[PDB]
Amino acid sequence: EVQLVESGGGVVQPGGSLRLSCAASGFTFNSYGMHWVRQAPGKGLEWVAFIRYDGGNKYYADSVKGRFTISRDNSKNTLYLQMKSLRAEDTAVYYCANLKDSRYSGSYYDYWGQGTLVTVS
Amino acid sequence: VIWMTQSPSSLSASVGDRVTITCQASQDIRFYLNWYQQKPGKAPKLLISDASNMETGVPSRFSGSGSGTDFTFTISSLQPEDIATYYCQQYDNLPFTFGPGTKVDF
Amino acid sequence: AYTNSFTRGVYYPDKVFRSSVLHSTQDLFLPFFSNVTWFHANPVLPFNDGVYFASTEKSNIIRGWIFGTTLDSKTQSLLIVNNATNVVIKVCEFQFCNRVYSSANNCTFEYVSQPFLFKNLREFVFKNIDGYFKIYSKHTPINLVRDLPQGFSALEPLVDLPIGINITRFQTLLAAYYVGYLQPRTFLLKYNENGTITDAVDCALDPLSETKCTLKSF
Ligand SMILES: *[C@@H]1O[C@H](CO)[C@@H](O)[C@H](O)[C@H]1NC(C)=O
Ligand SMILES: *[C@@H]1O[C@H](CO)[C@@H](O)[C@H](O)[C@H]1NC(C)=O
Ligand SMILES: *[C@@H]1O[C@H](CO)[C@@H](O)[C@H](O)[C@H]1NC(C)=O
Ligand SMILES: *[C@@H]1O[C@H](CO)[C@@H](O)[C@H](O)[C@H]1NC(C)=O
Ligand SMILES: *[C@@H]1O[C@H](CO)[C@@H](O)[C@H](O)[C@H]1NC(C)=O
């Protein structure tokens, strides 16, 4: 059984910071790149960030670039997202995922966590 | 950044009806498009990859095709369990993007 | 399931002959004491920056490998298949089945040579740099049943193919194997009087190895 479990959500003030984590199990975590995807209430899906398998190369959406940092610890099978200078617009349910991608990550399987809610108020 | 558009934003259909959803890219993304199905309170499920390749476990009533900028998602015979919001996603280049989402209801 | 590549996956980094010398090189190597995935069989795996593959299965069990992206008729794919007398390597827009493929249109590359494959452990390293698909290999006897062997053995260049395609995913063709991944690491390689690598230090493993690399000594 493959699982992805997000945690570290909650309520923060504007201008504050929050760090999310995703515990991975059931698959070879350290062989796949990982993504963060968020979905605001009543809105569609938005891609946030991507990190390679060694944690070496990192990519961000223009809307979060410079404010969000993506990282991973392959000894703990855990993916992290550090969010600084959080805005009201950043209120969303955050998911960790392994998105099927024949060009960049090389993942042949598609996995998602249940998601965790981050509220800025 | 590649802009993704979908049409219709919402459609009503009965059981047995044929449902077609259009997805258009502002740039030529070849055949690097994913289709997702999301139900309320749940994470998105992948149905189609590489524009037209079906995922394992996905019912044969689902299909898709297209190349370049114009892609189509089709349900040949809508079932009661197919009521969901459908998204298209490009992975031709980073950043990756999702379309607006098309809501299918009865 | 995981196993410990204690000192496995080291290959000759170039074609320069060296002897009685310690040489420091920056290249893609399997990190020492890394976690290697232990497979039983047969999923499609990511290729990443290069792959370390090892098995103790017979040549009539592991037939070869497929490397590519979409692994279908939409793109060029690299097919490496061994048989009783030869090995055939082709690059085509293959449509794979489930004897391996139903069609092979738009072929751009073909190469034929001699076969690539108490037990006998076979180790391979697959790299894809600047259009060249580089394969290294070693064949050694083994007396282990549930893990990788301890000790050092360097892999030699087997073939260098000017295929000119991108590889992001691969799958093993079966009729029990290990898969690891290469990373940019600094190694200190020890060449004996015959130009054979007999040892190595991973300079980013621990404080002791760092000291050994700094002083260029084992
Ligand atoms: C192969 O594709 C990857 C995609 O991440 C790209 O970074 C790399 O430069 C490509 N290699 C060649 C030779 O095109
Ligand atoms: C290998 O995996 C084990 C868990 O089974 C972990 O404790 C160990 O630190 C990992 N080693 C490396 C190099 O990742
Ligand atoms: C191995 O493949 C080559 C090339 O296709 C073929 O000529 C040869 O007969 C094959 N060997 C056997 C035993 O089939
Ligand atoms: C073979 O592949 C090349 C692309 O490398 C393409 O331009 C050519 O039209 C293809 N030939 C056939 C018969 O499909
Ligand atoms: C080097 O080769 C010679 C044979 O010419 C052999 O006797 C010697 O043992 C070899 N040295 C090592 C370290 O294997």
Numbering used by the authors:
A (entry chain H): 1 to 121
B (entry chain L): 1 to 106
C (entry chain A): 27 to 67, 81 to 137, 158 to 176, 186 to 243, 264 to 306
From the paper:
SARS-CoV-2 infects target cells using the spike glycoprotein (S), which is organized as a homotrimer with each monomer comprising an S1 and an S2 subunit. The S1 subunit harbors the receptor-binding domain (RBD) and the N-terminal domain (NTD), as well as two other domains designated here as C and D. The RBD interacts with the angiotensin-converting enzyme 2 (ACE2) entry receptor on host cells through a subset of amino acids forming the receptor-binding motif. The S2 subunit is the fusion machinery that merges viral and host membranes to initiate infection and is the target of Abs cross-reacting with multiple coronavirus subgenera because of its higher sequence conservation compared with the S1 subunit. The two lineages B.1.427 and B.1.429 (belonging to clade 20C according to Nextstrain designation) share the same S mutations (S13I in the signal peptide, W152C in the NTD, and L452R in the RBD) but harbor different mutations in other SARS-CoV-2 genes.
S2M11 was used to lock the RBDs in the closed state, and S2L20 was used to stabilize the NTDs. The structure revealed that the B.1.427/B.1.429 NTD antigenic supersite is severely altered. The N terminus is disordered up to residue 27, as is the supersite β-hairpin (disordered between residues 137 and 158) and the supersite loop (disordered between residues 243 and 264). These structural changes explain the abrogation of binding and neutralization of the panel of NTD-specific mAbs evaluated. Because the S13I substitution resides in the signal peptide and is predicted to shift the signal peptide cleavage site from S13-Q14 to C15-V16, we hypothesized that this substitution indirectly affects the integrity of NTD antigenic site I, which comprises the N terminus. Mass spectrometry analysis of the S13I and S13I/W152C NTD variants confirmed that signal peptide cleavage occurs immediately after residue C15. In the absence of the C15-C136 disulfide bond, the N terminus is no longer stapled to the NTD, consistent with the structural data showing that the N terminus of the B.1.427/B.1.429 variant becomes disordered relative to the rest of the NTD. Although the S13I and W152C NTD variants were respectively cysteinylated at positions C136 and W152C, the double mutant S13I/W152C was not cysteinylated, suggesting that C136 and W152C had formed a new disulfide bond. W152C is in the β-hairpin of the antigenic supersite, and the formation of a new disulfide bond with C136 would move residues in the β-hairpin >20 Å. Collectively, these findings demonstrate that the S13I and W152C mutations found in the B.1.427/B.1.429 S variant are jointly responsible for escape from NTD-specific mAbs because of deletion of the two SARS-CoV-2 S N-terminal residues and overall rearrangement of the NTD antigenic supersite.
